[PDB]
């Protein structure tokens, strides 16, 4: 088709939208849907009842957030369909949606009942030509421009590992785990309660969200820092007021190397990676090591890759080379992938058409994703 | 200006404003990790004369007629 | 021979271990006099504390030490502390130890400051802080199930299985007697009756103890309200002045159940409680809703355990019975779980001592609380 | 009706009327009723038992002055009507108050009977057509031309703080003292008797207000003005006798800003604006405090926005940007939004129509109101 397909990471803290082609995604917005919670009362205020995006951020105060997808699940449909709608709108792209082919990235070993819904939503509510559903890892890949890797996606909803050997991915080998980046700022609400900082508002969570991204470090060794006395590092807070988050600061993102703080009893980061390689047939397992790939935002942490390497040489052989490979833009990597997919011809052949779709139903959709 | 000279109960010779004294990554670069630059325009070209084949592809956890293998091969 | 002193943001629940109910219960207040530059009186007290700011309400400003089970002002609660111990009880602290209670997921400061000042201040042998629902499951002899205990500063529910405590599933939510009685004053307001001071305040919560009731239907109970005059009654204020508040008698406790109308955007008292059943394993849910027990004072609404069991069985599955635990002494339900636990001879090692303090310090407190 | 609307504030000191296409009120006169100081059986004497607005300034001396209303509400009914009526005389407009239809300027807050009865006066007495209760803080924005801004309404009867952002007022941070310009009127009286000059009279409470708008300034430090020798400048009265105020002039206001120095349980001015803000949602503190806006009579005293900015300062965080953006029109502000909200389109669809008050009930004013 002559109109460039358009590529949606629907990715559960931020959606990334753009045009196939474009060597960066145009238009990422956060993924929530923002009502206002106080009363209008003057004439010429803010129109409408929903604000999605930039508007949101503007206005956060003013408005209560919800987000409508948690651990890679689409729990409100209605909302999803707004923000999708959104991407379409003047705002971000700017174009009609019959017009344009779509490529939806949802996550690995995601319920079979969200990809039916994402599917029907997109080909009645909006009409499109076609639409691909493809995993965030096999992308992942397509932007380094490597064939083997296991990608290690810590996402802001859910952290997975794929290995991929030479095009193929092993689908009994796929490890995920719903603890992730949202867990971790829900973790660090709960300690900056503890120190005396009290965050309760759907609005206030996201300047938690903020705490989150600027000031938290992995420690290398967790025991060892716990003892020592820390320095109480001041954060600058929106209104103006400093907050001293102290030990909260090193405890918090440790939660995706150890679920046992929240309470889950589920396999940590360190361990999610070396069972998707470990699960995988004897002869891979040195190059599947060797190549490691680190995807999503949540992988950004100060030390993460120190941590990482240390904690995977433990439970790895002795003895076995394990080169973690970072690209300089881990929170846009999926999309980048994408484009690229996008770009070839073979996509084409990949794509269920509206008269595909219509016909099978369900079925089609199920068949040619992976 | 003249609309307010003419009602009696009016700031006169007061300042109109009262207002204060106006005031004027750590990961990416890590040496554990191995820094890769993404050049989509490189990759594009690489992967650009693959093809896949759809014919006879089903990913779906559908039990009859043994294993399956989606995409098949290339022209 | 041992002290338990519950520390209420309300209500300071004092008394001597074993014994059935507290001896001295007293509001948590210091009142300091609206004094001018004139030269006052004979029999002049410089801060007056409980039962006698209570008398003199008129003239002395009613600060509560306690905000939301935090201590602000320490120099406050220190002089409660000497009105509990030499005045209210009359027992010296230097002979008995104290057992305190303190509210889940409250900052760390306060129960560090809290035993800091009972060690080195009023010099006790012993100091054991403990979680006020975990001493309210002792009352009904039962140590399986949940409880929400809904005190005057905040109300927390916490899960206990076969005397296992699940500290993950424990849930915190400011909305508390205090919030009910500061909503009341606002919709008294909107009738005609103005209460703005502090000592009006404290009348305000005498009208709301006597006369406010939890409404089964609350879209039912306005429709009544509104055509008929049979649920509005008078109360007579210390001045001979009588009032009618009418259709406000149960619109005050609804907040609980819906905190939208405080404006705090926040699950209601009925759904965190369902919340931190979900939040359990799937296998003791089941003892959970046959044992929800109701705590505090702010559970002692005519109509509550009613209203609780419908919402509650609404949420939960048809299958499940949900029974709601409702003892006559619910507002001493905290004390009389606390004179249980001390008297038992299992407890005698659990305190924390004077020689233990010295040499750790006030940080040994988060290991031995619980 | 299409004929022009007639704005009327409320304003317990002085009522401003006026139609809605004048820039500024016409009509201002004293919001007090007039009736003979002497009981009056004999003829030579005040005929009629009423004098109103200019023609009681007249003949002040001999009348006694009676507000009809006190802290934003309306205590007798039946001297009201009086006033509302004097609106529609010869004196001041001159019209039929069955043609034009009417805009309200009621505090927020105040008693819903206020609200029920003042509706009932002006649909059952006066024939109006149509009528609209309205918020004095919402109008003071209208008349600026910003949507966003904190106002800070100090009127004679109450002094109230409303934060409005982007067209929408939070109602649960709002804040409402009934310190305020007629409280500062009496604490000089009992000041000026601590000087040695007695205004007994209802009529000599009326020049004490004089003195008060003629001479009384808000020193910047309140403790080294006291120190300093005052220069005691002189004021001249009615009768022609010259009194010397000296220190009692600075230290009357400044019960404004610390209103626990004679004795009154309140928060104060500089505080109630603070505390709105704080109130208010984290991420809009910043905003607010750079878009505040002064109302009412009571801001006009001198050094007054000197005062409230270094007072304000203190309280707010630390680099926080404060704009307290009075305009010159202070006292007319509240009237200039309602003229200007009156003109627009919109304004023929918020009002409510007599027969709709017929038909709807008594809800349809509150219901509207917002
Ligand atoms: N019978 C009642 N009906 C309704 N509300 C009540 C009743 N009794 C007390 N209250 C309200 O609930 C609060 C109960 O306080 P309580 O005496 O339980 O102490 P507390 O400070 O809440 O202690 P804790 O947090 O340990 O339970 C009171 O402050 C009052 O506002
Ligand atoms: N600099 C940072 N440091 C730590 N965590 C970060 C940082 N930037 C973003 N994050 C986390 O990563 C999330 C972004 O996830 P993202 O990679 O966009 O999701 P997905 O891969 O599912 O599309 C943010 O919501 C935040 O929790
Ligand atoms: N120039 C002035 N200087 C000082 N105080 C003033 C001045 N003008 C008015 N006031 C005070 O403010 C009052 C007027 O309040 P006003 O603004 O009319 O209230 P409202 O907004 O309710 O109509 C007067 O009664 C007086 O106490």
Chains 1, 4 share one sequence.
């Not at chain 1, 080909?123 to 995993?135: G, R, Y």
């Not at chain 1, 829900?186 to 609005?203: A, I, P, Q, T, V």
């Not at chain 1, 001041?234 to 703080?261: C, H």
């Not at chain 3, 207040?29 to 002049?44: D, L």
Request: proline letters at 5%; charged letters at 25%.
């Amino acid at each position: 088709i002559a109109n460039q397909p358009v590529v949606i990471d629907n990715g559960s803290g931020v959606i990334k939208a753009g045009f196939a082609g474009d060597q960066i995604p145009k238009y990422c917005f956060p993924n929530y849907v923002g009502r206002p919670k106080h009363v209008r009362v003057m004439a010429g205020a803010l129109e409408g009842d929903i604000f999605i995006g930039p508007k949101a951020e503007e206005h956060r105060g003013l408005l209560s957030i919800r987000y409508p997808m948690e651990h890679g699940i689409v729990k409100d449909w209605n909302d999803m369909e707004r923000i999708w709608q959104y991407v379409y709108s003047k705002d971000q792209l700017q174009t009609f949606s019959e017009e344009h082919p779509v490529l939806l990235t949802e996550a690995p070993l995601n319920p079979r009942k969200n990809r039916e819904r994402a599917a029907e939503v997109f080909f009645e509510t909006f009409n499109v030509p076609a639409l691909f559903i493809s995993m965030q890892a096999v992308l992942s890949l397509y932007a380094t421009g490597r064939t083997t890797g296991v990608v290690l996606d810590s996402g802001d909803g859910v952290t997975h590992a794929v290995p991929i050997y030479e095009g193929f991915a092993m689908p009994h080998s796929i490890m995920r785990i719903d603890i992730a980046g949202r867990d971790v700022s829900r973790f660090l609400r709960l300690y900056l309660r503890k120190e005396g900082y009290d965050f309760h508002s759907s609005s206030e969570f996201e300047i938690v969200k903020a705490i989150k991204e600027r000031a938290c470090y992995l420690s290398i060794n967790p025991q060892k820092d716990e003892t020592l006395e820390t320095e109480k590092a001041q954060y600058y807070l929106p209104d103006g007021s400093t907050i001293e988050i102290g030990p909260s600061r090193f405890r918090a993102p440790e939660l995706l190397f150890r679920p046992d703080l929240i309470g889950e009893e589920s396999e940590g980061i360190h361990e999610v990676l070396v069972f998707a390689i470990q699960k995988s047939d004897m002869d891979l397992r040195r190059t599947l090591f060797s190549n490691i790939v680190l995807s999503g935002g949540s992988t950004l942490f100060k030390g993460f890759g120190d941590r990482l390497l240390s904690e995977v040489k433990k439970l790895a052989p002795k003895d076995v080379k394990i080169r973690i490979s970072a690209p300089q833009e881990r929170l846009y990597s999926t999309w980048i992938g994408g484009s690229i997919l996008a770009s070839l011809d073979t996509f084409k052949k990949m794509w269920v058409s509206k008269k595909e779709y219509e016909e099978d139903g369900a079925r089609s959709i199920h068949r040619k994703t992976f | 200006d003249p609309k307010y000279a003419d009602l009696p109960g009016i700031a006169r010779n007061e300042p109109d404003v009262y207002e204060t004294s106006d005031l004027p990554l750590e990961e990416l670069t890590s040496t554990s990790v191995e820094h890769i630059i993404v050049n989509p325009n490189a990759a594009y070209d690489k992967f650009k004369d693959k093809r896949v084949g759809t014919k006879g592809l089903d990913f779906s956890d559908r039990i009859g007629k043994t294993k399956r293998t989606g995409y098949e091969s290339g022209e | 021979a041992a002290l338990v002193v519950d520390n209420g943001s309300g209500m300071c629940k004092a008394g001597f271990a074993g014994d059935d109910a507290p001896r001295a219960v007293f509001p948590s207040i210091v009142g300091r006099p609206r004094h001018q530059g004139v030269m006052v009186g004979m029999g002049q007290k410089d801060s007056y504390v409980g039962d006698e700011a209570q008398s003199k309400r008129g003239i002395l400003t009613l600060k509560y030490p306690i905000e939301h089970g935090i201590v602000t002002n320490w120099d406050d609660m220190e002089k409660i502390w000497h009105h509990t111990f030499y005045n209210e009880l009359r027992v010296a602290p230097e002979e008995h130890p104290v057992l305190l209670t303190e509210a889940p997921l409250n900052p760390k400061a306060n129960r560090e400051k809290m035993t800091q000042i009972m060690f080195e201040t009023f010099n006790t042998p012993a100091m054991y802080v403990a979680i006020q629902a975990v001493l309210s499951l002792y009352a009904s002899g039962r140590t399986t199930g949940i409880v929400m205990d809904s005190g005057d500063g905040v109300t927390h529910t916490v899960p206990i299985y076969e005397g296992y405590a699940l500290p993950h599933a424990i849930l915190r939510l400011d909305l508390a007697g205090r919030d009910l009685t500061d909503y009341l004053m606002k919709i008294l307001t909107e009738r005609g009756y103005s209460f703005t001071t502090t000592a009006e305040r404290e009348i305000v919560r005498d009208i709301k103890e006597k006369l406010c009731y939890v409404a089964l239907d609350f879209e039912q109970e306005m429709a009544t309200a509104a055509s008929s005059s049979s649920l509005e009654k008078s109360y007579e204020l210390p001045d001979g002045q009588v009032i009618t508040i009418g259709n406000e008698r149960f619109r005050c406790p609804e907040a609980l159940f819906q905190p939208s109308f405080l404006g705090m955007e926040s699950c209601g008292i009925h759904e965190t409680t369902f919340n931190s059943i979900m939040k359990c394993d799937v296998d003791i849910r089941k003892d959970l809703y046959a044992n929800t027990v109701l705590s505090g004072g702010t559970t002692m609404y005519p109509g509550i355990a009613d209203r609780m069991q419908k919402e509650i069985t609404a949420l939960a599955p048809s299958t499940m019975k949900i029974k709601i635990i409702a003892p006559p002494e619910r507002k001493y339900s905290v004390w009389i779980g606390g004179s249980i636990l001390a008297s038992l001879s299992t407890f005698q090692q659990m305190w924390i001592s004077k020689q233990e303090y010295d040499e750790s310090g006030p940080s040994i407190v988060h290991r031995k609380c619980f």
